Amino acid sequence: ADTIVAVELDTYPNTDIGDPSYPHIGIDIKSVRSKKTAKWNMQNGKVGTAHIIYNSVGKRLSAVVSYPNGDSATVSYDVDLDNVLPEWVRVGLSASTGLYKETNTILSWSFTSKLKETNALHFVFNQFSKDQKDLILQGDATTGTDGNLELTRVSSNGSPQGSSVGRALFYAPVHIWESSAVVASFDATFTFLIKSSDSHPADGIAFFISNIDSSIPSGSTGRLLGLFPDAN
Amino acid sequence: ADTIVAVELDTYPNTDIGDPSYPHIGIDIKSVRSKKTAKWNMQNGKVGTAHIIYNSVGKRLSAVVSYPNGDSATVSYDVDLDNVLPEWVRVGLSASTGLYKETNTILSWSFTSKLKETNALHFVFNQFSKDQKDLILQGDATTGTDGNLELTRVSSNGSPQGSSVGRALFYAPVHIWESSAVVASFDATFTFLIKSSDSHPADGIAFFISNIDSSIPSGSTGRLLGLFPDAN
């Protein structure tokens, strides 16, 4: 099925599948058992920011997840993203719950990709609306009317629903790498919430880059973060 | 001595000093003796493109030199720029000749750095005006009216001079990093034209970052590319 590259904000330590025994940031190529990991003191009911970064020069997919007080987790992975990505992708946000539950609200998301000024796409959402008729919603993901994108389902009380999955995908396909392009970079920034009354939050939010017709692979909830079919 | 961090377009293999035995591109930290270099198929009198990129996350300063045919040279180097230079710098272009000579012509030059809720300087010159009131030209540097930046001396007939040093710094000091800053990233790009009618062109162009009052360290023509006092 899908070719997937992601950055997991993995809030539940699903250890029988590879995850570290704490909440982590990860870089996920073609599989949820990340190819790198780093420890992420995972705050609750607080709004945080993730910055994801990459350039076809240094070939280092990098990410930071931070919260207002200063607590920051960093993770990084060397990789020639092309060999793994097709000339054309769509990029999107994904989150899930299952069984154990957490609000997966996106307050903002912006993204830039650049191919060398030659070719560039830049978008920013600082408020989600209505019908955001330039997102391709999938699963439980819904926007507004508090200006926000609930990636996963939430009761009108504010209660996050277990076994929920969701996706937001930028409508236009992103020219992520052209072969002859000396430089092919991209960055993406989104702000999160993750409020969970439960013992542990689960499952997380993930930015991902997939093929143009990517859909929520069947039965990827909880720890599969809506990105992957099985746990390979 | 100036805190100097640079990306060299070293046309001349000054060998009794460290340069590899061919024209090269490299990242110099506090020394004209590149922390790492790469071979560079310098094309005489063709219009080239430099990109410098850095992200405080992946900690990788990276550079690409390119020509319109496809001939493209890359270099990368891991470094926390927190550690090398101050909160505040000035950025600039530099070039030089010696007894060997070449044109050090800058067609365009653009620069972005972004901190972090976000702090950001972006500037771009595609056309240098003869009274370039926001560049701090130094030494043999002059602009326009050929909508260009001449970093080293050019006789009224396009003819490079020997023993010539020129520098172009952006007027404002760049906040290149603050410690609260989750992301401290920059990039620069220039497009240049280096021609020569001696046996070999010399000596090169460079993008550099130094402290806020950086003057051309004395006697740094030819192989020191106006960045370093001597050859340590």
UniProtKB/Swiss-Prot annotation, chains A, B:
In Pfam terms, one family for this protein is Lectin_legB
Q: Does the keyword Metal-binding apply?
A: yes
Record keywords: Manganese included? yes
Q: Which residues bind a carbohydrate?
A: Y12, L99, Y100, R223
Q: Which residues bind Mn(2+)?
A: E8, D10, D19, H24
Q: Which CDD domains match?
A: lectin_legume_LecRK_Arcelin_ConA
What Gene3D superfamilies does UniProt report for this protein, alphabetically?
2.60.120.200
User: Which keywords accompany this UniProt record?
Assistant: Calcium, Lectin, Manganese, Mannose-binding, Metal-binding
Xref: InterPro entries: ConA-like_dom_sf, Lectin_LegA_CS, Lectin_legB_Mn/Ca_BS, Legume_lectin_dom, Leguminous_Lectin
Could you list the residue ranges forming a coiled coil in this record?
A: none
User: For binding Ca(2+), which residues are annotated in this chain's numbering?
Assistant: D10, Y12, N14, D19, D203
Q: Give the miscellaneous note.
A: Binds one manganese (or another transition metal) ion and one calcium ion. The metal ions are essential for the saccharide-binding and cell-agglutinating activities.
Stated family: Belongs to the leguminous lectin family.
Q: Outline the subunit composition.
A: Homotetramer.
Name of the protein in question: Concanavalin-A
> Which species is this record about?
Canavalia lineata (Beach bean)
